[PDB]
Structure 1
Amino acid sequence: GSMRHERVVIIKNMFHPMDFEDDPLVLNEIREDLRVECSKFGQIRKLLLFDRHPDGVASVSFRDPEEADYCIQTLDGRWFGGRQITAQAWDGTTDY
């Protein structure tokens, strides 16, 4: 087994907060789309979007550390909604 953070992926550049200015529903569109996409890598335990964060941060927690690893390897550098995203392992201590 593993400490919790080994199951957690930090995804950046999913959005910019300006995206939700005119239409709050856009935030939920990106949440849903990220749920659908991250379901490819493993069983999602938690998914959060830090909707005010300039860097477009989301956290995704999986059931198993191997799922997080597969997500990081596959999503990093992909394009979503015109944005080139990154995916990194969480460190267990950085808050967004």
Structure 2
Amino acid sequence: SMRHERVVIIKNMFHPMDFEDDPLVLNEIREDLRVECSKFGQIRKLLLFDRHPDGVASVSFRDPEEADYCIQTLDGRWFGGRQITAQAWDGTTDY
């Protein structure tokens, strides 16, 4: 929503039950995401909201073009049954 927003919100990337019966899956998913997103730009912060029912992650980049690139590439990508969405953070919603 901000003119030069650097924070990307990714949704539908997991369900919290994915982590119930194997505690290694969370770290695998987190680094899978870090590996993919570091092709797009310098990551300043990466967060998985591992109990959010909507499967939310946020990736903060150094430059707005990096967030724009990430969004373009990831949004609508299929992943374990769901289309993930990727959008600029509105600058207010918590997860």
Same fold (TM over 0.5): yes
Specify the alignment match of 2:65 in structure 1. 66
> RMSD of aligned C-alpha atoms?
2.0
Question: Equivalent pairs: percent with the same residue?
Answer: 100
- Partner deviation per Cα, 1:35-67 (whole Å, 9 max, x = no partner): 001111111111000000010000000010110
Distance (whole Å) between structure 2 residues aligned to residue 5 and residue 24 of structure 1: 36
Contact 1:5 1:91 in 2 (8 A): no
**Shift in alpha-carbon separation, 1:74–1:47, aligned structure 2, 3 A:** same
What is the TM-score when the length of structure 2 is the normalising length?
0.92
Q: In 1, distance between residues paired with 2:81 and 2:30?
A: 16
Number of residue equivalences = 95
SS of match in other structure, 2:72: helix
Q: Distance in 2 between matches of 1:48 and 1:24?
A: 17
Greater helix fraction, Structure 1 or Structure 2? 1
Q: CA deviation at 1:33?
A: 0.1
Q: 1:36 to 1:69 in 2, by over 3 A?
A: same
1:91 deviates by 1.0
- TM-score, normalised to structure 1, is 0.91
Give 1:5 deviation, angstroms: 7.3
- Structure 2 Cα separation of the partners of residues 83 and 44 of structure 1: 25
Deviation at 1:4, TM superposition (A): 10
Conserved? CA contact 2:2–2:90, under 8 Å:
no
Cα 1:87/1:24, change in 2 over 3 Å: same
Aligned partners of 2:35, 2:42: CA distance in 1, in Å?
11
Structure 2 gaps, min length 5: none
